[PDB]
Symmetry: none
């Protein structure tokens, strides 16, 4: 349960330091195990929990979101990969467009289908451009993307400027979960130079030095999974960001 608005929470943090978010996949473990992962990451210094996977079991995301809501005090932010990934127990939702998908369903179609449910639940919705970078991982394939090549910083900055002009105040550079190498520092730095978006970067950020370089390159938010204890992994990532 997080009363305050997540977006102002983000701005409060950013006047002193960078934000870390921990991504939890609801299928990958029980709600109770999710609570334990989340507590470990909070003891590691994480600033919030992103919740999202690939599930249509509505009760199952809800059981995780509700369990987290009753046991942690940092925001629960929905990060949906399907349209059913909206839960009333969460504090906010990254309402994103998959910008470099060639499939209209991932650009706007899923969003139109889910919009009414987001409105009726009254959950704070943060507008986000979502850009998959090479290699792109599972989301780059399932979302029918053309991953931005690592050597094309200019493509990423043009989509960010475009996305910002359309009103997406958050921008997410995604190398894909498990990516061997994280989003290049060259591309993070050019994007941050070109827009005033809250700049989010995820994928392949494993070590404290990975996080120092992503943070040093201009990322406002760093996103990581919990593959490794979990507390040590997160705290070392948080220390690298500092």
């Amino acid at each position: 349960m997080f009363k305050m608005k997540v977006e102002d929470y983000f701005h409060d943090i950013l006047r002193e330091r960078k934000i870390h978010l921990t991504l939890i996949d609801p299928e990958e473990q029980t709600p109770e195990e999710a609570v334990e992962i989340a507590r470990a990451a909070i003891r590691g210094g994480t600033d919030g929990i992103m919740l999202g996977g690939s599930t249509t079991d509505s009760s199952e995301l809800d059981n995780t979101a509700r369990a987290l809501r009753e046991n942690i005090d940092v925001p629960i932010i929905l990060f949906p990969g399907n349209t059913t990934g909206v839960s009333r127990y969460a504090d906010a939702i990254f309402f994103m467009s998959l910008l470099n998908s060639t499939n209209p369903y991932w650009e706007i179609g899923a969003q139109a289908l889910g919009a009414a449910t987001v409105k009726k639940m009254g959950i704070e919705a943060l507008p986000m451009g979502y850009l998959v970078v090479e290699p792109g991982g599972t989301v780059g394939w399932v979302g029918d993307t053309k991953p931005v090549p690592r050597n094309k910083p200019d493509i990423a900055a043009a989509y960010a400027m475009a996305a910002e002009f359309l009103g997406m105040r958050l921008f997410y550079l995604e190398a894909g979960s498990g990516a061997p190498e994280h989003v290049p520092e060259e591309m993070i730095a050019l994007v941050k130079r070109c827009t005033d978006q809250i700049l989010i970067v995820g994928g392949g950020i494993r070590s404290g030095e990975d996080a120092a370089r992503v943070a040093g390159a201009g990322a406002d938010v760093v996103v990581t999974g919990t593959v490794v204890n979990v507390e040590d992994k997160i705290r070392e990532i948080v220390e690298g960001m500092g």
Copy 2:
């Protein structure tokens, strides 16, 4: 409900045709949906289909549980996705939207929810789903090229292809609330070319609508609610043709 839904279908089809009542879990409340279902059962329906609709998330699980505890016919998930899944249903129509041009509705959504369907042990009925002109909201949202009412050969060829891929049920869909149901000529040609269980839905309002559709060769007639009298006239219509 206990026995297999597909076995129950074949047992009915020994004597007469099957009627199913489509309930959208967003058009009413779980308890209002229970009375509608009881009204349809009083009218002679053989099962409840559930049901659109993209709407909410928990609104589906709540309707399936309420109905399950108060009726004795099966509850069959009719996903307008394959992104619905409730544990309280007895079976799911596992459909491919055959004449979509978007691979996401052909196979992509089905793959994203296959693990959830496997995780629950819910009976999965393999179904080819074919949108017929005009096609309604699903034909537009599903990126379909609706089969023209004057091209029954196209419908038959898609039904034969679906059959050779293992889809034992085939669903001709005029669209919810369509002005005219699927033409009798097209129902009849599909039934001739194929051994599938042939399901027809969309715009079947009156007993005469139901008699023409069943007498053209439908094994299953799907209608919505728009009263026990209405469903009873439809069932009597289906029976006059025996």
Copy 3:
């Protein structure tokens, strides 16, 4: 101009509704556009949209600088092809064609021109652009699936998604020279569902056309002598 176009919109709407006049830079001449625009300001238009349906654009920057020098009304770019960006306009309808099947009109062209829009100082109005059936030519070139007129729920869904992604303006488009305007039931449902500046254009010829459209909930009416005087009073 010397004012933000979006406040100028908000001021007008806390007491009335907005009309904008759409001029194609290639069909006129700079002066004939300065005249067709000035004759429109007499009929009571609140601003001039510049937009070329075709792909030609040699006369855009010349129509822009011309209009910039003789009118006090804002000049808003309504990009048709890609080039439709000039240093002399006061703002841009920076829009995504939401129901296109071509990603080039959803995001691609917007990415190509974004650095130029930012290099110049042009105020960017973030806008969702929905083509409504029958759609005219824009529905075709745009590779759209035009929204059916009897499905206002589909248009409302796209409007709500558009606003959750941060587009504060929403444009309902029937296509230039459409036989009808966007249906009133569709305008009203979208207006109920979002807080967007709701814009409606295409097929609005008469003061009577512009009364049902404005009366159904549109904040901005777009049309393309002073029969716009007839139109401006229809919105009263």
Copy 4:
């Protein structure tokens, strides 16, 4: 060949893995194809697959007829286009190319050929066809998004989806001439997730390749004439 091909498969899999020999009817004359097939059978192949990018179809019928008259293992059509259906075969892999972005290869070409498959008496085996990185020429022509080699979970999700749609055969395709066959990890997870007959092809040239692919959990190994070579491959599967 008298017995239903699908039951033949199930009978073999009670005891060992199946090997199939892929022959392109356009890469040699019918008589040479009979020679190749009989040599593959002497090496222990269990069946002939007949397929390719067909351009002319009298060649497919002449090869299939020559094979039907001179061998005693089944002839299974593996059609590259709707062109590829001959009455002289015993069965057909009736397949959907699952990770194509083109409806024509997902269902369209299948719908165009269905009436012909029905009019012939030909046993139709329902099959999900999944192209894996790198994917060869079929991956590029088929407008596929090849499944990355490090994404076995994507393949398993497609196999499960195909299974729930009634496709009882599943074919993991690395592409003809692939430098590396389908990863063992990916074969293993598909096999653990579904009850399909699991078929793997592309880049399988040695007895060691075949041993890795069958040991990882393939039921059927497909190769194409790389008696000595087939024997080496079949014995690697042993």
Copy 5:
């Protein structure tokens, strides 16, 4: 036939307009197709088009062999699948389905069939193929957005692009069985906008249909045999006169 089909076309077009009779090899025996063609040629038809169908290749070569032996007008392939090429034809309409959303029908199948077309030495006529509303079965199977009957400038724009890409022939297709042939206004605007040999087919069932289509500016009218073939073809060719 021995002479280039394309030169033959230009010869006729100096004097009058061209008629082609479309035969589908699947719907009769080759013997019967020779009789159909001979009857059509006794009507004023200028050539036989083979195609329209998507199945089996063996039947096409037999049909093309039989006609080449028994007629003196060109045999022109109008293929449906990348299979439908036979060495017994005088020419092929090498088409791109231009208003398909599917790359396979724009270039893909053409790239699969091209080496075969080159293997035979068959004259290939470069052709843009535009499906016009309603569009028939080809417009649905080919994943097209049919040009609306009331947007002739969209048709002209595609015809002008096809011309600039080298497609010297252009086919406006209303679809087999269309209730109305392509509109005269749309035929006329394409002809005014390009130098292409303009071909029009679908929904042309009477001498009056053919008169209005040819009169609106078509260079080639394509019809089927709408036994009584000779009389009917005669009605169509005289309608174009």
Copy 6:
């Protein structure tokens, strides 16, 4: 300011030698500097100027083309990356279909959008198949292509024959601007063998050696930028490149 048809001009040159064209982006310099760049390349022996890039600012394509039209005597050929890339002042346009895009807009859509403008300006239109080869560069990414793999020359040959049978008398093998490697020799040679198009090769050509291998493998037209950034360009590099081809 080139009177004469550029395609004629091309066949006339290919009677004796191979053609080189210099690609200039109207956005990365002023019309004056562009003129200086072109005169530089021309003295090092280029046969024409291609105007390319993704044109943004409405008029400086027009301004660059007109400035070149008045000051040079080899053809100016538009190499457009999007709708606007058309101007009175060029002598010819490469009227291209992006053959291996999966998006109809890049295959025929943009072309039909711009066709009337081409005709209205009387600009000479050269019918061209355009084929993106791995890696493909920014053009192959914006154009939603499946780049042809460097080890699938038979795919490129099939597309070239298809495009020839469709009337595209010119064929462009494109590795992508900035590509680390030019199109493979093996693939250039097979395309040259299979068709009789004017065969143009561009992308990743940085040296006399590169241009020698590309021309020697079968290219009729070699396309490069200036490579050098400061001139130094007229030609030194271009002369090295034009001499490598001979």
